[PDB]
């Protein structure tokens, strides 16, 4: 659920999910269409695509448990949806941590019309 994901992001990047990653680029938050603007935005594109492989699950509201084993993120045993949702979130957090260097405030609150809608997952 958004609760776990937002906490995972804070621990990793030090930034708060909202408003740092809630409305960034074309795919972070109201991800929908367009060409990802940068690395961080690609992180969200792939994340959105990751949730897309789980049609009968509910990523926003289903809670899963996870632990830290010396900085490492470990998804604990839960239901299939919970295990797979955690794996998707875990990737995004690492992806975000990997592209902090190129995170640009220039992309916060990015306008809709500027998204050239075409990347198939």
């Amino acid at each position: 659920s958004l609760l776990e994901f937002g906490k995972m992001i804070l621990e990793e990047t030090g930034k708060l999910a909202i408003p740092s990653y809630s409305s960034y680029g074309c795919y972070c938050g109201g991800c929908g269409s367009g060409t990802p603007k940068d690395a961080t935005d690609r992180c969200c594109f792939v994340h959105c695509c990751c949730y897309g492989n789980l049609p009968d699950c509910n990523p926003k509201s289903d809670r899963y448990k996870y632990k830290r084993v010396n900085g490492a993120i470990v998804c604990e045993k839960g239901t299939s949806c919970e295990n797979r949702i955690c794996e998707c979130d875990k990737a995004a957090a690492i992806c975000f941590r990997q592209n902090l260097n190129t995170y640009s405030k220039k992309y916060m609150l990015y306008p809709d019309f500027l998204c050239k809608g075409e990347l198939k997952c």
């Binding site: 708060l16 999910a17 909202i18 408003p19 809630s22």
Partner: peptide, 5 residues
């Protein structure tokens, strides 16, 4: 905010 999208 914190707890969401």
């Amino acid at each position: 905010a914190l707890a969401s999208k």
